[PDB]
A paper describes a structure:
To determine the three-dimensional structure of the ECD of mouse [name] (referred to hereafter simply as “[name]”), we produced this domain as a glycosylated secreted protein using human embryonic kidney (HEK293) cells, crystallized it, and collected X-ray diffraction data to 1.95 Å and 2.15 Å resolution from two crystal forms. Attempts to use molecular replacement for structure determination failed because of a lack of discernable homology to known structures and the low quality of predicted structures. Therefore, we produced, purified, and crystallized a fusion protein between engineered maltose-binding protein (eMBP) and [name], collected X-ray diffraction data to 2.3 Å resolution, and used molecular replacement with eMBP to obtain phase information. Fitting this model to the electron density map of eMBP-[name] provided the starting point for iteratively solving the structure of the [name] half of the fusion protein. Molecular replacement with this structure was then used to solve the structure of [name] in the two crystal forms described above. ABD1 and ABD2 have, respectively, three and two intradomain disulfide bonds, a large area of interfacial contact, and one interdomain disulfide bond (Cys52–Cys466). This structure is observed in all three crystal forms (eight unique [name] structures), with a global rmsd of 0.7 to 1.1 Å among structures. In particular, Gate-1 side chains show a concerted inward shift within the ABD1 pocket and, together with multiple other side chains in ABD1, largely occupy the interior of the superimposed ABD2 pocket. These distinguishing features of the ABD1 and ABD2 pockets are observed in all eight [name] structures. A comparison between the bound and unbound [name] structures shows no major conformational change upon lipid binding.
Adenomatosis polyposis coli down-regulated 1 ([name])—a conserved single-span transmembrane protein containing a large extracellular domain—negatively regulates [name] signaling and plays important roles in hair follicle development, CNS vascular development, and glial differentiation. The [name] ECD consists of two closely apposed β-barrel domains (ABD1 and ABD2). ABD2 contains a large hydrophobic pocket that accommodates a bound lipid. Collectively, the results of this study suggest that [name] serves as a negative feedback regulator of [name] signaling by neutralizing [name] ligands.
Residue numbers in the entry: 50 to 388, 392 to 405, 409 to 473
Write the structure that this text describes.
Amino acid sequence: SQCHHMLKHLHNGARITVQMPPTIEGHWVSTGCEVRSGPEFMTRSYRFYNNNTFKAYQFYYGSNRCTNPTYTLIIRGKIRLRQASWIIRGGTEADYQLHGVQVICHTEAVAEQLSRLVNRTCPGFLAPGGPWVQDVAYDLWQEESNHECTKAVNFAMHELQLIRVEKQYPHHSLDHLVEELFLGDIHTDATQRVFYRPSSYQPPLQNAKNHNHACIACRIIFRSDEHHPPILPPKADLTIGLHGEWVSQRCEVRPEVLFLTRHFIFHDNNNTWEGHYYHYSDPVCKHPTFTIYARGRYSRGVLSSKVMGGTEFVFKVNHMKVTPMDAATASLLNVFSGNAEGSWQVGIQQDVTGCVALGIKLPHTEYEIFKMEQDTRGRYLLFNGQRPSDGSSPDRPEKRATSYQMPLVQCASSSPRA
Ligand SMILES: *[C@@H]1O[C@H](CO)[C@@H](O)[C@H](O)[C@H]1NC(C)=O
Ligand SMILES: *[C@@H]1O[C@H](CO)[C@@H](O)[C@H](O)[C@H]1NC(C)=O
Ligand SMILES: *[C@@H]1O[C@H](CO)[C@@H](O)[C@H](O)[C@H]1NC(C)=O
């Protein structure tokens, strides 16, 4: 359980095989309570049938534990896989056609809030007698009626345009095949969701036939429908305890920056942090491009009022070092090094932090959102804020994320257990 060991052997040393071309035929489910920008607390139950049609459930909830359903969307349509993405290596592009979007409200309060929101968004949309009632499917989109108000709920289905299926086995075992469907990332800005071409992935869905055996949420969701939405178990909220070391569980994908792993170190004795960002050109993180080392200070935590389960931090970067890891990276940095002798070299670390290179601004302050959970094995998971989809920095409080990146796993600690 050394940090270096877990970075050498991502996802507990699991061997990953990529279905190329991808086979999406089957039932795929969320592995927990997902957070989309907003925030939206939701689970997915997506069925892709052999005739290339799909029925997708999006179950929405009022909290980060997904114990109290609010409304469910039932999204019907047809999907056709095109070819391997040239932008996202390991990704496969696809085209889709919506046949229908229906909404069911699971409480009176939601029926009345949602009907009001549909009316404010699309004044000419609602029927005469009064507000919507619970447990009734209302049309938000019909393929043969010409009307629609999906903008009310900030709906779009562009996630179906980028597809990756990973097959996962334990390092030395042919028992426990886990199949994961990666669909396109959801834009962090709701308004931009209608025009966004995914360049990264949502958290993976797991196949109802080949899911991790410890995935409780998987089993609950598989037995659900629009009139019985998945009720997830109420896990207790953990308090943020940063002290120690955290590493990526996977070859991560960020919008516009592609593949990377992270190694973070937190010192709670003086609120100082270090980040290593190992950047790669490939989706199994074997071919390095450049490494960023960053160091600075963080604030005390304040529980978020915007995002149930989240803790607000301010993070300041005071120091930065860059290591080009291939000749192309060193070449690009040398071409864009003015007065003098930046002398960038493969594998040689240089401090950027009296002047700065590449017009990098230091110090740099970010407004962060963190949560801590446990995996099925009782290992601690650290989530920080989803990176803005447009490549921008959360550099003002109002630009703080309302959703999370994929989690880091703790690899060093000085906290007890008994
Ligand atoms: C596609 O297949 C499913 C069977 O799982 C069926 O319910 C659905 O109606 C079929 N679609 C069409 C257009 O025939
Ligand atoms: C619907 O929205 C419009 C615009 O805000 C408002 O003027 C109207 O009164 C609303 N309708 C109802 C029935 O509340
Ligand atoms: C903070 O504490 C860590 C761990 O002892 C130490 O390495 C680091 O130098 C300290 N930094 C400052 C600025 O005091």
